[PDB]
Amino acid sequence: SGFRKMAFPSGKVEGCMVQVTCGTTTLNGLWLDDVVYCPRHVICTSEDMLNPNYEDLLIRKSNHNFLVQAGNVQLRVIGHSMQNCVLKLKVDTANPKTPKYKFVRIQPGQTFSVLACYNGSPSGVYQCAMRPNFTIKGSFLNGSCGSVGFNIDYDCVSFCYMHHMELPTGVHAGTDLEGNFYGPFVDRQTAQAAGTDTTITVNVLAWLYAAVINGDRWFLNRFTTTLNDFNLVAMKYNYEPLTQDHVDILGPLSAQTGIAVLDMCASLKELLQNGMNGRTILGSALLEDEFTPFDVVRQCSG
Amino acid sequence: SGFRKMAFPSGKVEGCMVQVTCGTTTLNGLWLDDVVYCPRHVICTSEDMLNPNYEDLLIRKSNHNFLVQAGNVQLRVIGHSMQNCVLKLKVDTANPKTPKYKFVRIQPGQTFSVLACYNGSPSGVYQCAMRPNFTIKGSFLNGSCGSVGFNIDYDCVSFCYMHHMELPTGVHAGTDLEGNFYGPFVDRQTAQAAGTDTTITVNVLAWLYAAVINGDRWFLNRFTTTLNDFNLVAMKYNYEPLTQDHVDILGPLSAQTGIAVLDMCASLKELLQNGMNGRTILGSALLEDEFTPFDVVRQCSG
Ligand SMILES: *[C@H](S)C(=O)c1cccc(C(=O)Nc2ccccc2)c1
Ligand SMILES: *[C@H](S)C(=O)c1cccc(C(=O)Nc2ccccc2)c1
């Protein structure tokens, strides 16, 4: 028992992290087979970042302008290309530590592990969720771009995020491994800002099931609700709408606990309307929305 | 910016995890050089667990009774011995992935990363603190014993915890790598229970400094307090006493933010006396005490 924000073991990703330097800009890259992936911003100067034309900047570079270091070893760059907002640096050597992998794009409301890295060296690992507004609430300092987010299933690493920047509210934006941004953000200097966000309802319900599995029951009640009435309440509290697919996805947790999904929705309605009256759930005094139903099943199945 | 419960990258520990089976009991072991460390409970039957004499149980075993599997490869056991509550299984082969390492015992109030493992396979990584009452609030299911806790400094893994059991409140107990339990717990069946706990004051103050570094300032005030008056309040709220060494340890964070330690203590006093009035700090509606001053400096230095 217990319930923690748990990341995937990071070793398979650690052995892919490298340092990429262009000019005076140093950031992280992801070395898979004989390619190193990194943010294309690495080819920019500070002055370049207002309306940069990356095609022009890149045509003015050659392979020797890219310094790739894998721990102690220099990797010889033998080709370079752009793919959306990422750069692909073809190298001399295939990474002998390449895991089985996929590039997947995730949905808002899905979670993933982040391996924060600086100068190609892994620093820490933590769990993040893609917010409805396509930002992530990460923990990143200068030099962290190029750090990646991922999930692991069996022995296969599904990379879903490369870090690019910090928005003015301190939340983070980046792309998928194909270089396509999550959300309406760009890799140039603008007044871009996170849009309005909402709470991920299905995840909050998953976490209430985790709490019941772990012995927190005080918020349960004998009541039930309809999906429509619940969604009226959700809309009032800036929660996203609950669909029948969400209800279906919560099926196994409902069966394990014997608490119907619409009964748990009645509990959530009460918690939104009344607050917690000084109590906690799984060690939190707020409703947590960064655990998916899958995260709960993975951690609480025993 | 941002502030997350961040674990150390787990790869160096992943390459040390193995499966140990004795009879019908399977658990995890830690393979370093040519020794595998695991909980001595592996030699028990269910009936053995009321007043077991482990010296008797072990003298009735031979090397061939221990099955050690490192992923796909069987490791031949060539010696066995007890060291307090852990078993040391000498094996045929030295682990080629052994990191630089130390066995350190930590203090209550210190944090560490936990690599949760099942059947020798790493499952997840998360950050934990040793509570004042020598339990940890982990996330562990059946089969997780033998999982370890650790910190990493430079390239050296300091192992500080091996998991043994779950107490009736759902919190966890285990030993150091020398097999000595943290706290007054034993590896036999008793009505043992976690003792009274307290909040780790110095860590809460560290986390308030993290919040200020990250732009949460609403809880600051122009007031200050004496150490004695603050500690009267701490005692009232089941917080541990703040020492001058704690104040000294908070020195760098105080200097970085320009908020004197006893000023931040005045803020903490107000928060304990008034609550939060519906606000949050670093995304929490409660005062967080599982970040050390070191954890804050490591993550918030930028
Ligand atoms: C690095 S995180 C990166 O890819 C990037 C993309 C877009 C914009 C920036 C930026 O403006 N400033 C930097 C520079 C270096 C490191 C972090 C942020 C960066
Ligand atoms: C395994 S976590 C372990 O070392 C252990 C030590 C002391 C007591 C127990 C126990 O009673 N029951 C078990 C058995 C197997 C796995 C977890 C707990 C276990």
Q: Which residues in B lie closer than 8 A to residue A166 (C-beta atoms)?
A: 1
The tokens 């893994």 sit on which residue? B157
**Token pair in block for residue A122:** 């892994």
Rounded (10°) CA dihedral B89, B92, B97, B98: 50
CATH assignment of the domain containing B179 = 2.40.10.10
CATH of the domain at B283: 1.10.1840.10
Q: B253 and B296 in contact (C-beta within 8 Å)?
A: yes
The answer to whether the Cβ–Cβ distance between A115 and B9 falls below 8 Å is yes
Helix (H) / strand (E) element for B74: namely: strand B73-75
Residue A114 three-state SS:
strand
A82 and A88 Cβ atoms separated by less than 8 Å: yes
Map tokens 């310094």 to a residue.
Answer: A67
Contacting residues of A for B10, CB less than 8 Å apart: 9-11, 125
- List the beta strands (DSSP E) in chain A: 17-22, 25-32, 35-39, 66-70, 73-75, 77-83, 86-91, 100-103, 111-118, 121-129, 148-153, 156-166, 172-175
Tell whether B51 and B169 lie within a shared domain. no
Tell me the pairing of strands A100-103 and A156-166.
Answer: parallel
Indicate which ligand has the atom closest to the C-alpha of A42: 1
On whether both A155 and A65 belong to a single domain, the answer is: no
Where a domain ends, among B149, B179, B197? Answer: B197
CA distance A145 to A151: 19
CA distances from A244 to A1, A205, A207, A241, B292 (A): 29, 13, 18, 10, 44
Under an 8 Å CB criterion, which residues of A touch B? 1-12, 14-15, 115-116, 122-128, 137-142, 166, 170-172, 214-215, 280, 283-286, 298-299, 301-302
- Does residue A119 share a domain with residue A8? yes
In this structure, are A166 and A203 located in the same domain?
Answer: no
Task: Compare CB distances from A7 to B126, B137, B170 and report the shortest one's residue.
Answer: B126
Q: Which residues of A touch B15 (CB under 8 A)?
A: 11
What's the per-residue H, E or C state across A203-247?
Answer: HHHHHHHHHHHCCCCCCCCCCCCCHHHHHHHHHHCCECCCCHHHH
Calculate how close chain A gets to B172, using CA atoms only, in Å.
9
- Going from the Cα of B61 to the center of ligand 2, the distance in angstroms, rounded, reads 19
Other CB atoms within 10 A of residue B221 CB: 12
Say if CB B125 and CB B115 are below 8 A apart.
yes
Q: Determine the structural domain holding residue A211 and report its residue range.
A: 198-301
Residues sharing a CB contact under 8 Å with residue A237, sequence separation 6 or more, in sequence order: A199, A272
Q: Of the candidates A11, A122, A302, which has its C-beta nearest B14's C-beta?
A: A11
Distances (CA, A) of B34 to B17, B55, B94, B119: 13, 23, 4, 20
Same domain, B118 and B5: yes
- Coil vs helix vs strand at B276: coil
**Closest residue to B215, CB basis, from A122, A138, A170:** A170
Q: Do B7 and A9 touch (CB under 8 A)?
A: no
Q: Which residue of B has its CA nearest to A13?
A: B11
Residues B24 and B129 in one domain: no
Q: Is A300 exposed, middle or buried (0-12, 13-18, 19+ CB in 10 A)?
A: buried
Question: Ligand 1 within 6 A of A167 CB?
Answer: no
Smallest CA–CA distance, residue A138 to chain B, in Å, is: 6
The edge-to-edge listing of strands for the beta sheet with B86-91 is B73-75, B66-70, B17-22, B25-32, B35-39, B86-91, B77-83
Q: Name the burial class of residue A299, with classes exposed (0-12), middle (13-18) and buried (19+) by CB atoms within 10 angstroms of its CB.
A: buried
> A260 Cβ partners below 8 Å, 6+ apart?
A224, A254
Tell me if B138 and A2 make a contact (CB, 8 A cut-off): yes
Question: How many other CB atoms are there within 10 angstroms of residue B97's CB atom?
Answer: 15
Scan for tokens 């190609």, then name that residue. Answer: A120
Assess whether A106 and A253 both reside in one domain.
Answer: no
| Closest atom of ligand 1 to CA, residue A145 | 2
Subunit contact A2:B171, Cβ cutoff 8 A = yes
Cα B228 to Cα A4, A259, B225, B267: the distances in Å are 35, 50, 8, 15
Technique employed here was: X-ray
Task: Compute the count of residue pairs across chains A and B with CB atoms less than 8 Å apart.
Answer: 127
Check whether residue B191 and residue B144 sit in a common domain: yes
Q: How far is B157 from chain A (nearest CA, A)?
A: 14
Residues B45 and B110 in one domain: no
CA distance A261 to B233: 44
Q: Which helix (H) or strand (E) holds B68?
A: strand B66-70
Domain count of chain B? Answer: 3
Shortest Cα distance, chain A CAs vs residue B86, angstroms: 23
* Protein residue with least CA distance to atom 12, ligand 2: B165
Instruction: Give phi and psi for A254, each to the nearest 5.
Output: -55, -45
- In terms of domains, do A148 and A8 share one? yes
Per the rule left: phi > 0, alpha: psi between -120 and 50, beta: everything else, B291 is beta
* A215 contacts in chain B (CB < 8 Å): 170
Ligand nearest to the CA of B37: 2
Q: How far is the CA of A119 from the centre of ligand 1 (A)?
A: 14
Domain boundary among B197, B230, B261: B197
Q: What Å resolution does this PDB entry report?
A: 1.6
Q: Which ligand has the nearest atom to the CA of B144?
A: 2
Residues A137, A265: one domain? no
* Residues A186, A203 share a domain: no
Positions of B marked catalytic: 41, 145
Q: Is the dihedral of CA A31, A36, A39, A44 positive or negative?
A: positive
B164 CB within 6 A, ligand 2: yes
Ligand 1: does its nearest atom lie under 6 Å from the Cβ of A187? Answer: yes
User: What is the per-residue burial (b if ≥16 Cβ within 10 Å, else e) of A203-229?
Assistant: bbbbbbbbbbbbebeebbeeeebebee
Cα–Cα nearest to B131, from B158, B149, B116: B149
Our measurement of the distance from residue A244's CA atom to the centroid of its chain's CA atoms, rounded to an integer in Å, reads 25
Structure tokens of B51? 């007043």
Active site positions of A, annotated: 41, 145
Structural domain ending residue among the three candidates A197, A225, A259: A197
Alpha-carbon span A20 to A75, nearest angstrom: 10
| B39 CA to centre of ligand 2 in angstroms | 8
What single-letter amino acid sits at A298?
R
Longest dimension (CA), chain A: 69
Query: Beta strands B17-22 and B66-70: pairing type?
Result: antiparallel
Please report residues of B whose CB lies closer than 8 A to that of A3. 139
